[PDB]
Ligand binder design. Structure first.
Ligand SMILES: *[C@@](C)(CO)[C@](*)(O)[C@H](CC(C)C)NC(=O)[C@H](CC[S@@](C)=O)NC(=O)[C@@H](NC(=O)CCCCC)C(C)C
Lengths: 244, 250, 233, 212, 241, 198, 244, 242
């Protein structure tokens, strides 16, 4: 029968590793780098687009930075198609929580659930895992600004600063070097762009190659506001930091 | 009878590559060239009609398809996989949108639905990915004109202009030189015909070339008068006669 | 050669053989010998029982299915339990719905059909047991041989199990004699015990070793063990 | 039916009649309306005869399974809830049962739980259940003290069923008595109303409404 | 749909998928549990590879199953959540039907039963997780400590460790834990736990985390400074030689 | 029906619940606690159909307790009362609906405010200074309209309930065997031992 | 790169289904059976190998009936043939249930055809290890069919399969030429006995038993009926008379 | 690969035979049947001295009249015991009597071959056979004191005496010589202790070995550690005498 053609996607190696989860992580190590930095007054999300053309429309483009909630957002590393499948369930989950409790979903609860879905494809069903790593940037009235990461194994952790995709090893050391606990957001913007600029496999870091976002409390409003930077806005902030 | 293929046929290799997606993309490279160009007041999608026999009737086989009154699709790769995708894309536009909102889906959302169907073909038990790249051109009230490309993986990208299939590498170069943000629709059709000529080995006319636009509303193509808000389809497939006119002065 | 075509029952070999079925047949050849034989009035089963140690009991070989029908087993006992249970239900159905004692021939056709479905479908293995079915329905005494391939043969006498070729040659030579043993059950059991001992290469047949079953004209299917079989030793 | 169970100084007293009726027809005068679940657990029965018998026998099995599973005797609260929850699954289906589950466990001491087919489950010190509950309640409440002797408590239970057996048309037969202690239940006999009534009348001086 | 037998027997009699699930456990971060006269203490190590974690929000290894029972684990982190949730649901279910919180042995038996079930069901792989389950039975002051493994086997321990370098820390406890006279105080019991982790983890106040469970639902995890103090005292004992 | 009353004062929610359990012509119990604690600062009382009443309460209790363990956090009274509503709103359109009317009394530790929610078996929630289920409301609603002030102390709130219980005892046909009274404030849930003769 | 014969539904590079061709080998291995179509009916005959004196004569019946008018005989794996008939018996009953009229032979043939073809479409099923000769009398005359393991079937004047298919066909083709204006029902029965004896030369080491059945408009009222006693002895003697 | 339920050329099921090798790696378990009762003993075998030995449960009660001893992958036995108990209690509910030891064992063995990958016939949802052998001992009114050995093959033998696990081959040879029809219960208890002491790697005491019996009068009891210690003390004296 079909026994002959089964890859056995959900089995352990003699070493105790999950073959497919391992190879999926390798796939992600080739995807454009994404960075998240949590400050005292907000969070930054910076991402590097891959294989850009001059004819590629950036205005209508949104491949790495997605809005999950009115207060939670994600950076994506890996298969965009796989990520959109999960992003949609996450959006549904946040809405179910709101319809049940009349309160916005706490960031960790939303993360645990996605991470639980990914873990499923690891243990049963004989299907391939999702080739995706997420950075989660969010806010709730319990923990304030939060930053999480999740990979194909369904494992998630909490960070002050983190990177996913290509050159994470190099990117994490640069962050560990320049990050301090009492950081202002405008400083965290610079660190994110500087780190990307150093780990880039491209010649230079330009606006048409970047996706950029912030989550910040109202400078006058008193509540939480998301901002997905537009091409012209990134071009502005890239001149400020000293990259042009 | 008993389907024993409940497991994935597309899995990760030690290098990180998803074999079946990559091979599907290889099938798309062998396919005939198709392209799309976005002008300020419209979008144009074009391809070559590669006939299997001089006894076959090429009119009975459309490589360009209407998806909604305002959205059209073209492809490179395996014909049959495209045909069944077109059927499903037309249906999903109703079930997942029109039956809910009483209006047609915007270009980006129908593209999103198409991509989902192809992502499932990457992960579901007992299936292979689709062997096609699509180019979807369309209009909606709040976005205007847009052009998308959908890959076998289920990924989609917005383009000012692009080409897929055989001569895509050379055609993308040719488009880069010629495209600007101030192109009128008649200019865009002119480039479309010129770019497609570099790909076509044989006869170049309205019988061997398939070309359609997303432009102004066509009230004479609606079929009925009376409702002022209903103005008519923006998708229009050009006739063999209409193509030849622009080729006489080309 | 055999390497590739024995992976499952669903697969044919280049010569037309089903190796999984053939390997199941081998389990019967390892099983302890049992013998069936009939006249016009009575049918008899004689079975040799096997133990593990001299501290263990001898596993039972004969199963009753109804008052008029029964069988003996050679090979995997759990499979024989599954098959005898089924045949019991089929006998039960025939009595309740039609008020009719199931014909032995039809019992065979049903067992044949049940064995077949295992030999053609992916996943399931074949059965690993042979059966000798004796009965007394509306058309006299019957004896049937079941092979887990599906083949079911109606016979006057036969044997299955290890060394069973000895017993079968004895019956083939004594055919004209025992078929006339009508209205004398004892002298038919005597012929069965003489048959089974033609397959004894190892040990002597003892009081807790031998098992006998008889069905007939005025005899409901009954099993004899222990001190009951003492007179045939 | 009439059934009662009450808690006092020296444990639990359980008393039941023994009559089964099908309308006005007396089906039986010798019914066991007490189920011995284990040496430390009793069940009483009122309402549908089959409903009580079947499900309380089933309860006995559920309790035995708890013993094998947990290596410890089931608590009164838990036993009652097995029945309570089963009964609730069938709510609206027409099961008819008024039950009491009485026992002793080290954790709980003496405990009585009332469970009915409506899904009601109540812990208490005094319960009377069945068509003749009110007739028992009148005698029981008007003589109950915590500090009653085991002897007096046994009598009061017996006398309470008698009171009900007399007035209620659907109660009678005989009285079955039980006493539950630290050491478990003790059976205290089957007393036929045919002879008990006349003995109680003479010795106590009660029942003057009756010519005799 | 998918029912392929993943956990099967091999010629020598082993279930290799279960055997490999143990290897995943051997890769996980070390976890240790020791019981005193009137307490149980769970110690777990944090990885040092990445020193940029947010401890406020990062999942900790010690999880409360109920108000009186705690669970720590070694192995695949993602797998542990599945086991924890099932155990937490069964805890609330047990309070509902029995009208009494779970005994530590019961909760262990349930978790162990789930693990076993995933070793002889089609389409699933074993849990790459071993757990330490600790707590106090309702109204009981006797300390309880249990271990489970991917095979589904479970048993109680005076002291046990799981995960990487667990051979080393077990060797320590075998010559340092007296069954005759267990640790009398809570402070005396916590000291031994920190001592054992110092065998496998290099100087790290950040690296060692401790949780103390007392009778009648009294669970409290220790701060970094408190644990740091235990380390500070222990390291001064050596230099006296 | 049973008596189910609630009143939010300055810094606490007070719940008073009927003590009797009557089936047919017999009062089976006179000390019934018609409430469940959902969390350290949230308490729910209940009244309705015989079985449904306790089964629904205990089911809701198991879910809120499960949430607390998972999250190591206590849901606000607003969040708990939305969860309860949706379960009833679900159940009313099922095969056999829970016939249970409830009151949620909670103190929000985050907002530092007491909260009272009235929810009926249909899933009709509303936040109130004072609430009542069953026939009880026909007497107490107008009484409280008159006597209630929004800044009353917990001591004033208890006096105000006694005035409600005195009225129900005088005018209502059923002997409900007095009430069990509970206070929900910043320090959690406690029972007023003496109300029967306070 | 081979292994094309290991799985059922697989096409080999030259376009074949090797698993069906391996089933054909199981048929060729089996006992020889034939069918003669006559001027108003059909005659079926089959060889029965007598391995031992112990097999009860006239008892192990091979030829089967579907409905009341169809007869079936098969070479190869007997259990498979029995399974195919159980299907035919269900199939005919279903047809009679809906259309009142008993199933026409061409209609019944395709019912077997689609069913046997179905067992060449999936890797989870084994092809049928039988060739089936079958036919009968319907609304418009006699029909004779032969069904191969592939699902292929055609109408025949005479059909043969199994061990002695070569001898049989060689003798059947002589009948078609010697009797151009049809053969009678009586004649065909006698002639069927000869063919079976002549095909037994292929298996001449063992003793055998003859089994014959017929379906004829004039001799059997268009119903399937076995050949017994005096008619069978007449056919046996005729075959013996033409052997010396 | 290869199918789960698949015959070898020799005529045996691969999975069943490999499962038998897992049992040979199990701890020793011994049963002895006498006319005064059946005795069941096990080797605890604790992997570390820190392990609390009395939490090793390899002797289990099935009903008051039926007991069980396990050897092999003992986690696999839990659902077998659960089935056994439910079968026993269920039989008592339908028939108001005690289940026969023979019928109980048969019910346990009915599970053993219910493994495969969505097969023909009935329904068999289990990926592999059980990796554990059972000794089932008990008493009923019909056949008296009985000892059964139930295997993952689905077949069960009755034994006068039986040893299972790692020491089983050396133990069965010893049990062959020792057992006679007229043994007393105390002789059998001392006999179980004598063989376990021989086949074990560790020195046998009341901590690493467990005794149990089943009698008509008191039913199935598992001996406490203080009782077993005294029988070990008694065995030491008897061996020393001759
Ligand atoms: C008192 C007699 C008051 O009824 C007890 O409740 C008594 C309970 C014992 C456990 C027997 N009940 C009782 O006898 C039943 C009264 C029925 S009530 C609900 O009206 N009687 C029965 O259960 C009788 N059976 C039936 O009514 C079954 C009818 C089925 C019709 C298809 C028996 C004759 C006991």
């Amino acid at each position: 029968g079909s026994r002959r053609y089964d890859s056995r996607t959900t089995i352990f190696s003699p070493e105790g590793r999950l073959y497919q989860v391992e190879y999926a992580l390798e796939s992600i190590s080739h995807a454009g780098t994404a960075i998240g930095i949590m400050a005292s007054d907000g969070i930054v999300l910076a991402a590097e687009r891959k294989v850009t053309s001059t004819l590629l429309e950036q205005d209508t483009s949104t491949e790495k930075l997605y809005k999950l909630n009115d207060k939670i957002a994600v950076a994506v590393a890996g298969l965009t198609a796989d990520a959109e499948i999960l992003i949609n369930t996450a959006r549904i989950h946040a809405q179910n929580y709101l319809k049940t409790y009349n309160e916005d979903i706490p960031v960790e609860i939303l993360v645990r659930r996605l991470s639980d879905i990914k873990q499923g494809y690891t243990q049963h069903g004989g299907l391939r895992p999702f080739g995706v790593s997420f950075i989660y940037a969010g806010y709730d009235d319990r923990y304030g600004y939060q930053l999480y990461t999740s990979n194909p194994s369904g494992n998630y952790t909490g960070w002050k600063a983190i990177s996913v995709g290509a050159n994470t090893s190099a990117a994490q050391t640069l962050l560990q070097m320049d990050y301090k606990d009492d950081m202002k957001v405008d400083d965290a913007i610079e660190l994110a762009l500087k780190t990307l600029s150093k780990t880039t496999d491209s010649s230079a870091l330009t606006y048409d190659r970047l996706e950029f976002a912030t989550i910040r409390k109202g400078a006058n409003d008193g509540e939480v506001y998301q901002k997905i930077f537009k091409p012209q806005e990134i071009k502005d902030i890239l001149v400020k930091t000293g990259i042009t | 009878m008993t389907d024993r293929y409940s497991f994935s046929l597309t899995t990760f290799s030690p290098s990180g590559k998803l074999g079946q997606i990559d091979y599907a993309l290889t099938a798309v490279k062998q396919g005939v060239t198709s392209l799309g160009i976005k002008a300020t007041n419209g979008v144009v999608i074009a391809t070559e009609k590669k006939s299997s026999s001089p006894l076959a009737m090429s009119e009975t086989l459309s490589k360009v398809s209407l998806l909604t009154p305002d959205i059209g699709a073209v492809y490179s790769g395996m014909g049959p996989d495209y045909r069944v995708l077109v059927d499903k894309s037309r249906k999903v536009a109703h079930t997942s949108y029109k039956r809910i909102y009483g209006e047609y889906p915007p270009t980006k959302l129908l593209v999103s639905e198409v991509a989902k169907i192809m992502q499932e073909a990457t992960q579901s038990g007992g299936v292979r990915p689709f062997g096609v790249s699509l180019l979807i051109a369309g209009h909606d009230e709040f976005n205007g004109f847009s052009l998308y490309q959908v890959d076998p993986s289920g990924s989609y990208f917005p383009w000012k202009a692009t080409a897929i299939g055989k001569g895509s590498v050379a055609a993308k170069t040719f488009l880069e030189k010629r495209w600007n943000d101030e192109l009128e629709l008649e200019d865009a059709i002119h480039i479309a015909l010129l770019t497609l000529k570099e790909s076509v080995e044989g006869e170049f006319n309205g019988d061997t070339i398939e070309l359609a636009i997303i432009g102004d509303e066509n009230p004479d193509l609606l079929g009925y008068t009376g409702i002022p808000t209903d103005k008519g389809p923006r998708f229009r497939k050009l006739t063999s006669q209409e193509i030849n006119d622009r080729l006489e002065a080309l | 050669f055999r390497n590739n075509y024995d992976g499952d029952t669903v697969t044919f070999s280049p010569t037309g053989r089903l190796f999984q079925v053939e390997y199941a047949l081998e389990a019967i050849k390892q099983g302890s010998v049992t013998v069936g034989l009939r006249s016009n009035t009575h049918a008899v089963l004689v079975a040799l029982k096997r133990n593990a140690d001299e501290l263990s009991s001898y596993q039972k070989k004969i199963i009753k299915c109804d008052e008029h029908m029964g069988l003996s087993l050679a090979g995997l006992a759990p499979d024989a339990r599954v098959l005898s249970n089924y045949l019991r239900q089929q006998c039960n159905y025939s009595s309740l719905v039609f008020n009719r004692k199931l014909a032995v021939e039809r019992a065979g056709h049903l067992l044949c059909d049940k064995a077949q479905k295992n030999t053609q479908s992916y996943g399931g293995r074949p059965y690993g047991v042979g059966l000798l079915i004796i009965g007394y329905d509306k058309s006299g005494a019957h004896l049937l041989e079941f092979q887990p391939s599906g083949n079911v043969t109606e016979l006057y006498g036969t044997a299955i199990g290890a060394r069973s070729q000895g017993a079968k040659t004895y019956l083939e030579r004594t055919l004209d004699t025992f078929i006339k043993i009508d209205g004398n059950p004892d002298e038919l059991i005597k012929a069965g015990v003489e048959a089974i001992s033609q397959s004894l290469r190892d040990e002597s047949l003892t009081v807790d070793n031998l098992s006998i079953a008889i069905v007939g004209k005025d005899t409901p299917f009954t099993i004899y063990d222990g001190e009951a079989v003492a007179k045939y030793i | 039916t009439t059934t009662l169970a009450f808690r006092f100084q020296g444990g639990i007293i359980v008393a039941v009649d023994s009559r089964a009726t099908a309308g006005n027809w007396v089906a039986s005068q010798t019914v066991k309306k007490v189920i011995e679940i284990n040496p430390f657990l009793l069940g009483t029965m009122a309402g549908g005869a089959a409903d009580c018998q079947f499900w309380e026998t089933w309860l006995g099995s559920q309790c035995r399974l708890h013993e094998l599973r947990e290596k410890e005797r089931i608590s009164v609260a838990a036993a009652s809830k097995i029945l309570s929850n089963l009964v609730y699954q069938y709510k609206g289906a027409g099961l008819s049962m008024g039950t009491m589950i009485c026992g002793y466990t080290r954790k709980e001491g003496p405990t009585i739980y009332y469970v009915d087919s409506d899904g009601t489950r109540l812990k208490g010190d005094i319960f009377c259940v069945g068509s003749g509950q009110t007739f028992a309640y009148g005698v029981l409440d008007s003589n109950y003290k915590w500090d009653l002797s085991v002897e007096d408590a046994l009598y009061l239970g017996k006398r309470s069923i008698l009171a009900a057996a007399h007035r209620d048309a659907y109660s009678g037969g005989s009285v079955n008595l039980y006493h539950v202690t630290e050491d478990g239940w003790i059976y205290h006999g089957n007393h036929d109303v045919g002879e008990l009534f006349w003995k109680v009348k003479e010795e106590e001086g009660s029942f003057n409404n009756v010519i005799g | 749909g998918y029912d392929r037998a993943l956990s099967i027997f091999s010629p020598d009699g082993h279930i290799f998928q279960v055997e490999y699930a143990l290897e995943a456990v051997k890769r996980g971060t070390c976890a240790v549990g020791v019981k005193g006269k009137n307490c149980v203490v769970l110690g777990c190590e944090r990885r040092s590879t990445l020193k940029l974690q947010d401890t406020r929000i990062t999942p900790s290894k010690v999880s409360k199953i109920d108000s009186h029972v705690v669970l720590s684990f070694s192995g695949l982190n993602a797998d542990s959540r599945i086991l924890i949730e099932k155990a937490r649901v069964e805890a609330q279910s047990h309070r509902l039907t029995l009208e009494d919180p779970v005994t530590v042995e019961y909760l262990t038996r349930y978790v162990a039963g789930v693990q076993q079930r995933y070793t002889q069901s089609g389409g699933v792989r074993p849990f790459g997780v071993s757990t330490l389950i600790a707590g106090f039975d309702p109204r009981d002051d006797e300390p309880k400590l249990y271990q489970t493994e991917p095979s589904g086997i479970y048993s109680s321990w005076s002291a046990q460790t799981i995960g990487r370098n667990s051979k080393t820390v077990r060797e320590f406890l075998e010559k340092n834990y007296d069954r005759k006279e267990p640790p009398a105080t809570v402070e005396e019991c916590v000291k031994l736990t920190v001592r054992s982790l110092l065998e496998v983890v290099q100087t790290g106040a950040k690296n060692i985390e401790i949780t103390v469970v007392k009778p009648d639902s009294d669970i409290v995890a220790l701060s970094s400074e408190e644990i740091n103090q235990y380390v500070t005292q222990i390291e001064q004992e050596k230099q006296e030689q | 029906m049973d008596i189910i009353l609630g009143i939010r004062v300055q810094d606490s929610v007070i719940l008073a619940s009927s003590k009797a359990v009557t089936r047919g012509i017999s009062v089976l119990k006179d000390s019934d606690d018609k409430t469940r604690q959902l969390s350290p600062h949230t308490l729910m009382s209940f009244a309705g159909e015989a079985g449904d009443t306790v089964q629904f309460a205990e089911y809701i209790q198991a879910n809120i307790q499960l949430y607390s363990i998972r999250e190591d956090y206590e849901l606000s009274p607003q969040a708990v009362s939305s969860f309860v509503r949706q379960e009833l709103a679900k159940s009313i359109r099922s095969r056999r609906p829970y016939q249970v009317n409830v009151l949620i009394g909670g103190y929000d530790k985050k907002k530092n405010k007491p909260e009272l929610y009235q929810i009926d078996y249909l899933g009709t929630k509303v936040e109130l200074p004072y609430g009542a289920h069953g026939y009880s409301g026909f007497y107490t609603f107008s009484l409280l309209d008159h006597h209630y002030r929004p800044d009353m102390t917990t001591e004033e709130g208890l006096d105000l309930l006694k005035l409600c219980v005195q009225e129900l005892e005088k005018r209502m046909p059923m002997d409900f065997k007095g009430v069990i009274v509970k206070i929900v404030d910043k320090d959690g849930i406690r029972q007023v031992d003496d109300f029967q003769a306070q | 790169g081979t292994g094309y014969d290991l799985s059922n539904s697989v096409f080999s590079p030259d376009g074949r289904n090797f698993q069906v061709e391996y089933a054909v080998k199981a048929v060729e291995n089996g006992t020889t059976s034939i069918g003669i179509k006559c001027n108003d009916g059909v005659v079926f005959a089959v060889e029965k190998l007598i391995t031992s004196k112990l097999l009860v004569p006239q008892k192990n019946v091979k030829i089967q009936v579907v409905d009341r008018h169809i007869g079936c005989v098969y070479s190869g794996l007997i259990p498979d043939g029995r399974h195919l008939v159980n299907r035919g018996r269900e199939e005919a009953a279903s047809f009679k249930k809906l259309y009142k009229t008993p199933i026409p032979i061409p209609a019944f043939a395709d019912r077997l055809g689609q069913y046997v073809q179905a067992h060449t479409l999936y890797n989870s099923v084994r092809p049928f290890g039988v060739s089936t000769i079958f036919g009968g009398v319907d609304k418009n005359g006699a029909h004779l069919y032969m069904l191969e393991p592939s699902g292929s079937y055609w109408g025949y004047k005479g059909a043969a399969t199994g061990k002695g298919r070569q001898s049989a066909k060689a003798e059947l083709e002589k009948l078609v030429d010697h009797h151009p204006e049809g053969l009678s029902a009586r004649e065909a029965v006698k002639q069927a006995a000869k063919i079976i004896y002549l095909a037994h030369e292929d298996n001449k080491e063992k003793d055998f038993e003859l089994e014959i059945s017929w379906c004829s408009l004039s001799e059997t009222n268009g119903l399937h009926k076995f050949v017994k006693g005096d008619l069978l002895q007449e056919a046996i003697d005729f075959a013996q008379k033409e052997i010396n | 690969d290869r199918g789960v339920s698949t015959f070898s050329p020799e005529g045996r099921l691969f999975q069943v035979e490999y499962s038998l090798e897992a049992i040979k790696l199990g701890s020793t378990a011994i049963g002895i049947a006498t006319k005064e009762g059946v005795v069941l003993g096990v080797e605890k075998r604790a992997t570390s001295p820190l392990l609390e030995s009395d939490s090793i449960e390899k002797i289990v009660e099935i009903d008051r009249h039926i007991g069980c001893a396990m050897s092999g992958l003992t986690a696999d036995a839990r659902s077998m015991i659960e089935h056994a108990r439910t079968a026993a209690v269920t039989h008592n509910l339908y028939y108001d009597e005690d289940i026969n030891v023979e019928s109980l064992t048969q019910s346990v063995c009915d599970l053993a071959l219910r493994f495969g990958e969505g097969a023909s016939g009935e329904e068999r949802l289990m990926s592999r056979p059980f990796g554990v052998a059972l000794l089932i001992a008990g008493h009923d009114a019909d056949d008296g004191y009985q000892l059964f050995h139930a295997e993952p093959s689905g077949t069960f033998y009755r034994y006068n005496a039986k040893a299972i696990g790692s020491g089983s081959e050396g133990a069965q040879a010893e049990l062959l010589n020792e057992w006679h029809s007229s043994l007393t219960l105390k002789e059998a208890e001392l006999l179980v202790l004598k063989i376990l002491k021989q086949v074990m790697e560790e020195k046998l005491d009341e901590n690493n070995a467990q005794l149990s019996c089943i009698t008509k009068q008191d039913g199935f009891k598992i001996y406490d550690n203080e009782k077993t210690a005294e029988l070990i003390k008694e065995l030491k004296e008897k061996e020393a005498a001759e």
